[PDB]
mmCIF file of C-alpha atoms and ligand atoms in Angstrom:
data_model
loop_
_atom_site.group_PDB
_atom_site.id
_atom_site.type_symbol
_atom_site.label_atom_id
_atom_site.label_comp_id
_atom_site.label_asym_id
_atom_site.label_seq_id
_atom_site.Cartn_x
_atom_site.Cartn_y
_atom_site.Cartn_z
ATOM 1 C CA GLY U 1 19.697 16.792 13.348
ATOM 2 C CA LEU U 2 17.324 16.263 10.369
ATOM 3 C CA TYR U 3 16.687 19.021 7.784
ATOM 4 C CA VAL U 4 13.448 19.226 5.750
ATOM 5 C CA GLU U 5 12.624 22.199 3.560
ATOM 6 C CA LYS U 6 9.043 23.377 3.960
ATOM 7 C CA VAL U 7 6.860 22.160 1.122
ATOM 8 C CA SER U 8 5.693 25.293 -0.642
ATOM 9 C CA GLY U 9 1.939 25.564 -1.055
ATOM 10 C CA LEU U 10 1.100 22.440 0.900
ATOM 11 C CA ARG U 11 -2.611 22.399 1.758
ATOM 12 C CA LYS U 12 -3.611 22.040 5.406
ATOM 13 C CA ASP U 13 -5.840 19.002 4.840
ATOM 14 C CA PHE U 14 -3.236 17.156 2.816
ATOM 15 C CA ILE U 15 -3.435 13.414 3.445
ATOM 16 C CA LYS U 16 -0.342 11.976 5.111
ATOM 17 C CA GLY U 17 -0.788 8.224 5.247
ATOM 18 C CA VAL U 18 1.105 5.017 5.820
ATOM 19 C CA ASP U 19 0.396 1.400 4.999
ATOM 20 C CA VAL U 20 1.266 -0.829 7.970
ATOM 21 C CA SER U 21 -0.596 -3.922 6.770
ATOM 22 C CA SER U 22 2.078 -6.268 8.147
ATOM 23 C CA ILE U 23 1.850 -4.799 11.659
ATOM 24 C CA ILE U 24 -0.371 -7.634 12.977
ATOM 25 C CA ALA U 25 1.809 -10.468 11.697
ATOM 26 C CA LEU U 26 4.924 -8.766 13.057
ATOM 27 C CA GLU U 27 3.327 -8.255 16.441
ATOM 28 C CA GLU U 28 2.469 -11.946 16.715
ATOM 29 C CA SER U 29 6.076 -12.704 15.845
ATOM 30 C CA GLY U 30 7.230 -10.879 18.952
ATOM 31 C CA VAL U 31 8.310 -7.638 17.287
ATOM 32 C CA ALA U 32 7.771 -4.503 19.400
ATOM 33 C CA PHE U 33 7.860 -0.803 18.623
ATOM 34 C CA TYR U 34 8.982 2.124 20.789
ATOM 35 C CA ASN U 35 8.878 5.910 20.673
ATOM 36 C CA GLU U 36 11.384 8.772 20.792
ATOM 37 C CA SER U 37 11.918 8.251 24.535
ATOM 38 C CA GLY U 38 12.672 4.578 23.997
ATOM 39 C CA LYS U 39 9.636 3.226 25.830
ATOM 40 C CA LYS U 40 7.469 0.456 24.402
ATOM 41 C CA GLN U 41 4.397 2.056 22.759
ATOM 42 C CA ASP U 42 1.640 1.195 20.246
ATOM 43 C CA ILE U 43 2.924 2.039 16.774
ATOM 44 C CA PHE U 44 -0.400 3.641 15.956
ATOM 45 C CA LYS U 45 -0.015 6.129 18.793
ATOM 46 C CA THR U 46 3.498 6.862 17.525
ATOM 47 C CA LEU U 47 2.256 7.329 13.968
ATOM 48 C CA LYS U 48 -0.342 9.817 15.225
ATOM 49 C CA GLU U 49 2.208 11.928 17.138
ATOM 50 C CA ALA U 50 4.255 11.859 13.932
ATOM 51 C CA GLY U 51 1.545 13.671 11.978
ATOM 52 C CA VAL U 52 0.022 10.687 10.137
ATOM 53 C CA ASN U 53 -3.733 11.017 9.552
ATOM 54 C CA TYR U 54 -4.438 8.080 7.288
ATOM 55 C CA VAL U 55 -3.785 4.382 7.267
ATOM 56 C CA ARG U 56 -3.866 2.026 4.284
ATOM 57 C CA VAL U 57 -4.447 -1.714 4.564
ATOM 58 C CA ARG U 58 -4.336 -4.357 1.891
ATOM 59 C CA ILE U 59 -7.112 -6.945 1.961
ATOM 60 C CA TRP U 60 -6.923 -10.400 0.410
ATOM 61 C CA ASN U 61 -9.952 -12.677 0.140
ATOM 62 C CA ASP U 62 -8.461 -15.976 1.325
ATOM 63 C CA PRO U 63 -4.683 -15.693 1.936
ATOM 64 C CA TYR U 64 -4.544 -19.268 3.223
ATOM 65 C CA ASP U 65 -4.183 -22.801 1.850
ATOM 66 C CA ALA U 66 -6.795 -25.535 2.286
ATOM 67 C CA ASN U 67 -5.429 -26.265 5.741
ATOM 68 C CA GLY U 68 -5.354 -22.703 7.013
ATOM 69 C CA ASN U 69 -1.679 -21.864 6.522
ATOM 70 C CA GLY U 70 -1.210 -18.190 5.644
ATOM 71 C CA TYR U 71 0.503 -17.336 2.363
ATOM 72 C CA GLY U 72 2.502 -14.754 4.290
ATOM 73 C CA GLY U 73 2.913 -11.111 3.380
ATOM 74 C CA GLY U 74 0.984 -10.329 6.549
ATOM 75 C CA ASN U 75 -1.846 -12.800 5.997
ATOM 76 C CA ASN U 76 -4.108 -9.799 5.417
ATOM 77 C CA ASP U 77 -7.785 -10.591 5.415
ATOM 78 C CA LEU U 78 -10.943 -8.787 6.455
ATOM 79 C CA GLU U 79 -10.262 -9.853 10.046
ATOM 80 C CA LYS U 80 -6.857 -8.197 10.284
ATOM 81 C CA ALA U 81 -8.194 -5.234 8.304
ATOM 82 C CA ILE U 82 -10.777 -4.639 11.038
ATOM 83 C CA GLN U 83 -8.190 -5.093 13.795
ATOM 84 C CA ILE U 84 -5.941 -2.575 12.090
ATOM 85 C CA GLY U 85 -8.902 -0.367 11.243
ATOM 86 C CA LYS U 86 -10.107 -0.200 14.839
ATOM 87 C CA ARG U 87 -6.662 0.790 16.085
ATOM 88 C CA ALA U 88 -6.300 3.500 13.429
ATOM 89 C CA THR U 89 -9.694 4.938 14.250
ATOM 90 C CA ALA U 90 -8.853 4.858 17.964
ATOM 91 C CA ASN U 91 -5.983 7.194 17.074
ATOM 92 C CA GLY U 92 -7.907 9.691 14.995
ATOM 93 C CA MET U 93 -6.810 8.346 11.616
ATOM 94 C CA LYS U 94 -8.957 7.583 8.553
ATOM 95 C CA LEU U 95 -8.695 4.229 6.798
ATOM 96 C CA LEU U 96 -8.016 3.416 3.140
ATOM 97 C CA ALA U 97 -9.333 -0.088 2.433
ATOM 98 C CA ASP U 98 -7.263 -1.484 -0.423
ATOM 99 C CA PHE U 99 -9.023 -4.497 -1.950
ATOM 100 C CA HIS U 100 -6.713 -6.651 -3.999
ATOM 101 C CA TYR U 101 -9.604 -8.851 -5.075
ATOM 102 C CA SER U 102 -7.128 -11.723 -5.035
ATOM 103 C CA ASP U 103 -5.943 -14.211 -2.437
ATOM 104 C CA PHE U 104 -2.378 -12.893 -2.627
ATOM 105 C CA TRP U 105 -0.204 -10.019 -3.914
ATOM 106 C CA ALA U 106 -1.747 -8.158 -6.851
ATOM 107 C CA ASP U 107 0.449 -6.115 -9.208
ATOM 108 C CA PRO U 108 1.081 -5.403 -12.915
ATOM 109 C CA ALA U 109 1.997 -9.064 -13.393
ATOM 110 C CA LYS U 110 -0.132 -10.922 -10.881
ATOM 111 C CA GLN U 111 -3.891 -10.310 -10.836
ATOM 112 C CA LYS U 112 -5.061 -13.846 -10.028
ATOM 113 C CA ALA U 113 -8.666 -14.265 -8.918
ATOM 114 C CA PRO U 114 -9.565 -15.485 -5.428
ATOM 115 C CA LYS U 115 -9.698 -19.289 -5.332
ATOM 116 C CA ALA U 116 -13.425 -18.939 -4.558
ATOM 117 C CA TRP U 117 -14.049 -17.063 -7.807
ATOM 118 C CA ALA U 118 -11.643 -19.440 -9.567
ATOM 119 C CA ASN U 119 -14.113 -20.919 -12.030
ATOM 120 C CA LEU U 120 -17.040 -18.503 -12.061
ATOM 121 C CA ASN U 121 -18.551 -17.001 -15.174
ATOM 122 C CA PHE U 122 -17.918 -13.282 -15.517
ATOM 123 C CA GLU U 123 -21.517 -12.436 -14.655
ATOM 124 C CA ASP U 124 -21.279 -14.394 -11.398
ATOM 125 C CA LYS U 125 -17.828 -13.080 -10.573
ATOM 126 C CA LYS U 126 -19.064 -9.495 -11.062
ATOM 127 C CA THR U 127 -21.872 -10.006 -8.565
ATOM 128 C CA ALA U 128 -19.492 -11.825 -6.194
ATOM 129 C CA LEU U 129 -17.080 -8.914 -6.221
ATOM 130 C CA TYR U 130 -19.922 -6.495 -5.491
ATOM 131 C CA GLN U 131 -21.122 -8.690 -2.622
ATOM 132 C CA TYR U 132 -17.646 -9.057 -1.147
ATOM 133 C CA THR U 133 -17.032 -5.319 -1.124
ATOM 134 C CA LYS U 134 -20.498 -4.609 0.234
ATOM 135 C CA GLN U 135 -20.169 -7.163 3.028
ATOM 136 C CA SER U 136 -16.597 -6.204 3.892
ATOM 137 C CA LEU U 137 -17.444 -2.521 4.202
ATOM 138 C CA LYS U 138 -20.610 -3.097 6.228
ATOM 139 C CA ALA U 139 -18.467 -5.250 8.520
ATOM 140 C CA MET U 140 -15.910 -2.514 9.046
ATOM 141 C CA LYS U 141 -18.702 -0.011 9.620
ATOM 142 C CA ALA U 142 -20.222 -2.225 12.315
ATOM 143 C CA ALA U 143 -16.834 -2.299 14.061
ATOM 144 C CA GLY U 144 -17.119 1.479 14.079
ATOM 145 C CA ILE U 145 -14.101 2.062 11.822
ATOM 146 C CA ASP U 146 -13.776 5.454 10.117
ATOM 147 C CA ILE U 147 -13.434 4.534 6.454
ATOM 148 C CA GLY U 148 -12.511 7.518 4.341
ATOM 149 C CA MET U 149 -11.377 5.886 1.118
ATOM 150 C CA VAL U 150 -11.630 2.594 -0.748
ATOM 151 C CA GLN U 151 -9.301 1.338 -3.428
ATOM 152 C CA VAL U 152 -10.939 -0.958 -5.990
ATOM 153 C CA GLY U 153 -7.935 -3.068 -6.982
ATOM 154 C CA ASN U 154 -4.141 -2.735 -6.576
ATOM 155 C CA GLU U 155 -1.909 -1.737 -9.528
ATOM 156 C CA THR U 156 -4.515 -2.995 -12.009
ATOM 157 C CA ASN U 157 -2.408 -2.049 -15.035
ATOM 158 C CA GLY U 158 -3.398 -5.112 -16.987
ATOM 159 C CA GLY U 159 -5.899 -7.162 -15.054
ATOM 160 C CA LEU U 160 -8.287 -7.629 -12.166
ATOM 161 C CA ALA U 161 -9.592 -10.798 -10.508
ATOM 162 C CA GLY U 162 -8.439 -12.990 -13.390
ATOM 163 C CA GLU U 163 -9.891 -10.611 -15.966
ATOM 164 C CA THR U 164 -7.611 -8.964 -18.540
ATOM 165 C CA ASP U 165 -10.135 -7.345 -20.885
ATOM 166 C CA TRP U 166 -10.614 -3.640 -20.163
ATOM 167 C CA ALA U 167 -14.271 -3.883 -21.184
ATOM 168 C CA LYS U 168 -14.846 -6.471 -18.473
ATOM 169 C CA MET U 169 -12.414 -4.800 -16.072
ATOM 170 C CA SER U 170 -14.443 -1.578 -16.106
ATOM 171 C CA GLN U 171 -17.532 -3.545 -15.187
ATOM 172 C CA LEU U 172 -15.760 -5.075 -12.184
ATOM 173 C CA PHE U 173 -14.555 -1.618 -11.204
ATOM 174 C CA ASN U 174 -18.123 -0.268 -11.207
ATOM 175 C CA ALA U 175 -19.270 -3.340 -9.306
ATOM 176 C CA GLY U 176 -16.903 -2.611 -6.443
ATOM 177 C CA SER U 177 -17.596 1.077 -6.817
ATOM 178 C CA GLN U 178 -21.348 0.455 -6.612
ATOM 179 C CA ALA U 179 -20.901 -1.280 -3.283
ATOM 180 C CA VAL U 180 -18.892 1.645 -1.912
ATOM 181 C CA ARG U 181 -21.493 4.166 -3.094
ATOM 182 C CA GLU U 182 -24.307 2.240 -1.435
ATOM 183 C CA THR U 183 -22.357 1.996 1.777
ATOM 184 C CA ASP U 184 -21.538 5.693 2.224
ATOM 185 C CA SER U 185 -21.462 8.712 -0.090
ATOM 186 C CA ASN U 186 -18.565 10.377 1.696
ATOM 187 C CA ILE U 187 -16.246 7.472 1.003
ATOM 188 C CA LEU U 188 -13.906 8.243 -1.876
ATOM 189 C CA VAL U 189 -13.447 5.590 -4.547
ATOM 190 C CA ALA U 190 -9.941 5.218 -5.933
ATOM 191 C CA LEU U 191 -8.334 3.147 -8.702
ATOM 192 C CA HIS U 192 -4.628 2.305 -8.330
ATOM 193 C CA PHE U 193 -2.113 2.133 -11.179
ATOM 194 C CA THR U 194 1.662 2.043 -11.484
ATOM 195 C CA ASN U 195 4.548 2.708 -13.881
ATOM 196 C CA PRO U 196 3.912 6.412 -14.542
ATOM 197 C CA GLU U 197 7.103 6.676 -16.605
ATOM 198 C CA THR U 198 5.583 4.637 -19.416
ATOM 199 C CA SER U 199 4.919 7.087 -22.242
ATOM 200 C CA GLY U 200 1.201 7.939 -22.356
ATOM 201 C CA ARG U 201 0.261 5.033 -20.086
ATOM 202 C CA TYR U 202 -1.839 6.993 -17.603
ATOM 203 C CA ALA U 203 -3.333 9.112 -20.389
ATOM 204 C CA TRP U 204 -4.535 5.930 -22.114
ATOM 205 C CA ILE U 205 -5.933 4.401 -18.917
ATOM 206 C CA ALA U 206 -7.736 7.604 -17.936
ATOM 207 C CA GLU U 207 -9.360 7.786 -21.390
ATOM 208 C CA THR U 208 -10.285 4.081 -21.336
ATOM 209 C CA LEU U 209 -11.873 4.367 -17.890
ATOM 210 C CA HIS U 210 -13.891 7.283 -19.192
ATOM 211 C CA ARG U 211 -14.987 5.468 -22.368
ATOM 212 C CA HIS U 212 -16.489 2.745 -20.156
ATOM 213 C CA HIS U 213 -18.114 5.106 -17.691
ATOM 214 C CA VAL U 214 -16.179 3.855 -14.677
ATOM 215 C CA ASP U 215 -17.381 5.651 -11.576
ATOM 216 C CA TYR U 216 -14.415 6.675 -9.392
ATOM 217 C CA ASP U 217 -13.176 9.809 -7.613
ATOM 218 C CA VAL U 218 -9.445 9.294 -7.123
ATOM 219 C CA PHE U 219 -6.812 8.296 -9.639
ATOM 220 C CA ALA U 220 -4.066 6.787 -7.500
ATOM 221 C CA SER U 221 -0.518 5.946 -8.491
ATOM 222 C CA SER U 222 2.467 4.121 -7.042
ATOM 223 C CA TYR U 223 5.787 5.890 -6.990
ATOM 224 C CA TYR U 224 9.145 4.279 -6.373
ATOM 225 C CA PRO U 225 12.002 6.496 -7.605
ATOM 226 C CA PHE U 226 14.055 3.334 -8.167
ATOM 227 C CA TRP U 227 12.149 2.679 -11.418
ATOM 228 C CA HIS U 228 9.330 5.161 -11.905
ATOM 229 C CA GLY U 229 11.064 8.045 -13.587
ATOM 230 C CA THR U 230 11.366 11.628 -12.467
ATOM 231 C CA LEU U 231 9.203 13.565 -10.044
ATOM 232 C CA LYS U 232 8.643 16.121 -12.796
ATOM 233 C CA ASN U 233 7.018 13.421 -14.926
ATOM 234 C CA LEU U 234 4.854 12.171 -12.076
ATOM 235 C CA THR U 235 3.521 15.649 -11.426
ATOM 236 C CA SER U 236 2.958 16.226 -15.103
ATOM 237 C CA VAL U 237 1.274 12.946 -15.985
ATOM 238 C CA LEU U 238 -1.034 13.198 -12.947
ATOM 239 C CA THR U 239 -1.930 16.808 -13.677
ATOM 240 C CA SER U 240 -3.213 15.661 -17.071
ATOM 241 C CA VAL U 241 -5.535 13.100 -15.543
ATOM 242 C CA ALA U 242 -6.791 15.744 -13.126
ATOM 243 C CA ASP U 243 -7.279 18.538 -15.645
ATOM 244 C CA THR U 244 -8.757 16.350 -18.357
ATOM 245 C CA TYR U 245 -11.057 14.171 -16.291
ATOM 246 C CA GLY U 246 -11.517 16.238 -13.183
ATOM 247 C CA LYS U 247 -10.345 13.515 -10.840
ATOM 248 C CA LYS U 248 -8.392 13.880 -7.620
ATOM 249 C CA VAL U 249 -4.928 12.341 -7.802
ATOM 250 C CA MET U 250 -2.521 10.919 -5.226
ATOM 251 C CA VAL U 251 0.344 8.553 -4.557
ATOM 252 C CA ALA U 252 -0.891 5.319 -2.954
ATOM 253 C CA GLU U 253 2.557 3.766 -2.480
ATOM 254 C CA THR U 254 6.073 5.121 -2.075
ATOM 255 C CA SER U 255 9.192 4.605 0.024
ATOM 256 C CA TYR U 256 12.956 4.914 0.052
ATOM 257 C CA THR U 257 16.043 3.253 1.493
ATOM 258 C CA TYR U 258 17.642 4.769 4.602
ATOM 259 C CA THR U 259 20.381 2.144 4.722
ATOM 260 C CA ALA U 260 22.019 -0.319 2.358
ATOM 261 C CA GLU U 261 22.103 -2.911 5.112
ATOM 262 C CA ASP U 262 19.667 -5.833 5.402
ATOM 263 C CA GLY U 263 19.038 -6.617 9.072
ATOM 264 C CA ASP U 264 16.614 -9.415 8.451
ATOM 265 C CA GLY U 265 18.581 -11.985 6.494
ATOM 266 C CA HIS U 266 16.229 -12.050 3.511
ATOM 267 C CA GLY U 267 17.592 -10.074 0.560
ATOM 268 C CA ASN U 268 16.093 -6.601 0.146
ATOM 269 C CA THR U 269 14.539 -5.049 -2.942
ATOM 270 C CA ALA U 270 16.734 -1.948 -2.826
ATOM 271 C CA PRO U 271 19.246 -0.556 -3.284
ATOM 272 C CA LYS U 272 20.660 -2.444 -6.255
ATOM 273 C CA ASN U 273 22.584 -1.767 -9.468
ATOM 274 C CA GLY U 274 20.579 -0.280 -12.301
ATOM 275 C CA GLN U 275 18.174 1.373 -9.888
ATOM 276 C CA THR U 276 17.950 5.152 -9.813
ATOM 277 C CA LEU U 277 19.134 6.635 -6.542
ATOM 278 C CA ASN U 278 18.722 10.397 -6.687
ATOM 279 C CA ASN U 279 19.058 10.692 -2.946
ATOM 280 C CA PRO U 280 21.767 9.308 -0.687
ATOM 281 C CA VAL U 281 20.942 5.995 0.959
ATOM 282 C CA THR U 282 20.756 7.546 4.415
ATOM 283 C CA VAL U 283 18.122 8.730 6.871
ATOM 284 C CA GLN U 284 18.423 12.260 5.478
ATOM 285 C CA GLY U 285 18.161 10.929 1.943
ATOM 286 C CA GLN U 286 15.036 8.959 2.762
ATOM 287 C CA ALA U 287 13.512 12.073 4.317
ATOM 288 C CA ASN U 288 14.354 14.066 1.172
ATOM 289 C CA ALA U 289 12.731 11.419 -0.998
ATOM 290 C CA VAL U 290 9.433 11.549 0.930
ATOM 291 C CA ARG U 291 9.481 15.329 1.167
ATOM 292 C CA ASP U 292 9.909 15.559 -2.614
ATOM 293 C CA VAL U 293 7.063 13.228 -3.463
ATOM 294 C CA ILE U 294 4.794 15.308 -1.244
ATOM 295 C CA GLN U 295 5.990 18.371 -3.114
ATOM 296 C CA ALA U 296 5.373 16.662 -6.487
ATOM 297 C CA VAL U 297 1.811 15.703 -5.581
ATOM 298 C CA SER U 298 1.184 19.121 -4.091
ATOM 299 C CA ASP U 299 2.372 20.835 -7.259
ATOM 300 C CA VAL U 300 -0.503 19.167 -9.065
ATOM 301 C CA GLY U 301 -2.721 21.766 -7.438
ATOM 302 C CA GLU U 302 -6.178 21.334 -5.948
ATOM 303 C CA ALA U 303 -6.308 17.753 -7.312
ATOM 304 C CA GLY U 304 -3.273 16.445 -5.416
ATOM 305 C CA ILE U 305 -4.823 15.139 -2.205
ATOM 306 C CA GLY U 306 -2.070 13.126 -0.587
ATOM 307 C CA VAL U 307 0.805 10.668 -0.359
ATOM 308 C CA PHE U 308 1.013 7.213 1.235
ATOM 309 C CA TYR U 309 4.256 5.763 2.536
ATOM 310 C CA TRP U 310 4.288 1.998 1.939
ATOM 311 C CA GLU U 311 5.161 -0.287 4.840
ATOM 312 C CA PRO U 312 7.249 2.012 7.046
ATOM 313 C CA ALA U 313 7.409 -0.577 9.798
ATOM 314 C CA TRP U 314 8.129 -3.913 8.114
ATOM 315 C CA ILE U 315 11.221 -4.318 10.274
ATOM 316 C CA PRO U 316 13.069 -7.627 10.919
ATOM 317 C CA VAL U 317 11.763 -10.264 13.316
ATOM 318 C CA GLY U 318 15.330 -11.026 14.350
ATOM 319 C CA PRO U 319 19.027 -10.387 13.427
ATOM 320 C CA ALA U 320 20.267 -11.414 10.009
ATOM 321 C CA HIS U 321 22.554 -13.997 11.581
ATOM 322 C CA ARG U 322 19.576 -15.969 12.873
ATOM 323 C CA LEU U 323 18.200 -16.812 9.425
ATOM 324 C CA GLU U 324 17.213 -20.312 10.519
ATOM 325 C CA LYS U 325 15.355 -19.102 13.582
ATOM 326 C CA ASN U 326 13.695 -16.310 11.592
ATOM 327 C CA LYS U 327 12.522 -18.652 8.851
ATOM 328 C CA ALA U 328 10.482 -20.346 11.552
ATOM 329 C CA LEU U 329 8.691 -17.124 12.471
ATOM 330 C CA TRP U 330 8.158 -16.001 8.882
ATOM 331 C CA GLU U 331 6.562 -19.367 8.208
ATOM 332 C CA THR U 332 4.435 -19.585 11.328
ATOM 333 C CA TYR U 333 3.079 -16.037 11.446
ATOM 334 C CA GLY U 334 3.531 -14.977 7.838
ATOM 335 C CA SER U 335 5.604 -12.024 8.996
ATOM 336 C CA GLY U 336 7.664 -12.307 5.830
ATOM 337 C CA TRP U 337 6.707 -11.310 2.293
ATOM 338 C CA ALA U 338 5.591 -14.860 1.568
ATOM 339 C CA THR U 339 5.570 -18.353 3.109
ATOM 340 C CA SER U 340 6.214 -21.643 1.354
ATOM 341 C CA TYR U 341 2.472 -22.339 1.628
ATOM 342 C CA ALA U 342 1.897 -19.617 -0.971
ATOM 343 C CA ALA U 343 3.325 -21.958 -3.607
ATOM 344 C CA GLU U 344 -0.159 -23.350 -4.213
ATOM 345 C CA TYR U 345 -1.311 -19.890 -5.376
ATOM 346 C CA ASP U 346 1.880 -18.444 -6.854
ATOM 347 C CA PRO U 347 4.378 -21.197 -7.756
ATOM 348 C CA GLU U 348 6.342 -18.720 -9.836
ATOM 349 C CA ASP U 349 7.572 -16.084 -7.363
ATOM 350 C CA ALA U 350 6.510 -16.708 -3.779
ATOM 351 C CA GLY U 351 6.717 -20.360 -4.753
ATOM 352 C CA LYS U 352 10.489 -20.509 -4.628
ATOM 353 C CA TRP U 353 11.492 -17.095 -3.313
ATOM 354 C CA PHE U 354 9.461 -17.064 -0.111
ATOM 355 C CA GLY U 355 11.159 -15.641 2.941
ATOM 356 C CA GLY U 356 11.289 -12.595 5.173
ATOM 357 C CA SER U 357 11.104 -8.834 4.707
ATOM 358 C CA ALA U 358 12.532 -7.205 1.600
ATOM 359 C CA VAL U 359 11.912 -3.654 2.740
ATOM 360 C CA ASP U 360 13.270 -3.536 6.282
ATOM 361 C CA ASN U 361 15.835 -0.999 5.067
ATOM 362 C CA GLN U 362 13.041 1.217 3.779
ATOM 363 C CA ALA U 363 11.224 1.625 7.083
ATOM 364 C CA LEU U 364 10.912 4.730 9.282
ATOM 365 C CA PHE U 365 11.872 2.609 12.304
ATOM 366 C CA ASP U 366 15.234 0.911 12.817
ATOM 367 C CA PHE U 367 15.905 -2.827 13.034
ATOM 368 C CA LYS U 368 15.260 -2.622 16.786
ATOM 369 C CA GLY U 369 11.805 -1.101 16.367
ATOM 370 C CA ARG U 370 12.864 2.398 17.344
ATOM 371 C CA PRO U 371 11.704 5.376 15.208
ATOM 372 C CA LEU U 372 14.191 7.116 12.916
ATOM 373 C CA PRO U 373 14.314 10.917 12.761
ATOM 374 C CA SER U 374 12.986 10.683 9.190
ATOM 375 C CA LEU U 375 9.602 9.845 10.718
ATOM 376 C CA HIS U 376 9.160 13.546 11.492
ATOM 377 C CA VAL U 377 9.060 14.308 7.811
ATOM 378 C CA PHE U 378 5.252 14.354 7.967
ATOM 379 C CA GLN U 379 5.312 17.397 10.238
ATOM 380 C CA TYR U 380 8.296 19.268 8.868
ATOM 381 C CA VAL U 381 6.895 19.514 5.339
ATOM 382 C CA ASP U 382 4.322 21.870 6.869
ATOM 383 C CA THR U 383 6.714 24.297 8.569
ATOM 384 C CA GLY U 384 10.207 23.088 7.928
ATOM 385 C CA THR U 385 13.092 22.552 10.305
ATOM 386 C CA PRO U 386 14.377 25.371 12.605
HETATM 387 CA CA1 CA R 401 15.528 -8.217 4.661
#
């Protein structure tokens, strides 16, 4: 019994995607997913029947230490990207290649360059980034993966591949963009930013990108109601970018908590005090959250092309009361957000906060790998619930 009010004015070709980057690590850890009926089934087939038509995957250059131990977080590299890509294509879903251009998590605070580009002069790093993108894409193409979109960077609010100067950042952006353009004209190029609540932040970035002639088609944004202000602001701030620079807009990342419980043993990101919780922390609440973001992006008009749910299947590898036994898995398969081996690259965070999943209570599947009714949100927004 899940209610979802039809999204008014939702376009038929609206992108409904999910980012299941951790799916491979979880699978190797023994985690399994089922369907409505309760029978074991490939998550990708389940996602398809749910109305999902796009899949996002993060890609790190070298998410491993000198000895080959994954930093965790899914150990996402070009290899896993292709594995995931192939499966998505096999299920009639486009792929969104999200290049972090880093060996590990990239966000508004961490934009470290791949160890390989560690000490390279800007000129050489620029050409390296172009090569990497070009090779990576050609590789995916060879595997026969349907690539529909490419993200040049992840939440590049203040940096990219060790670069923090917007003049040099723009050049790296075009470098990656150039590779995409040469690979296929139909592929959309997107830049990803976050923190839309910051007064005039997106307006400034849009203008800056334009001043440096950065060639991109989609202006993507993250959206987590816990900290990113109101949906009215999101819609508004994105509409400006669209109207003023004629770019398509979209939400690259978003999610919500369906339970306050942590069934993994590793403390979760939400919910917590100080965080904004406009919807109840329940399956219905989570569905409302997603349905509203879709509405918010749709209200942008022609420019709003889609929404991406972030990690809807990063469920626990085992019960919370097996912490010790889980730690083993997280460490061996990198099925957690980070492994101790990531300390060499990020001694700050992952260095002494490595562990399991922090978003298992924000998935569309339960702790047992079974789909929650909130997974049907992707269909209901079209018609609604009887
Ligand atoms: Ca957890």
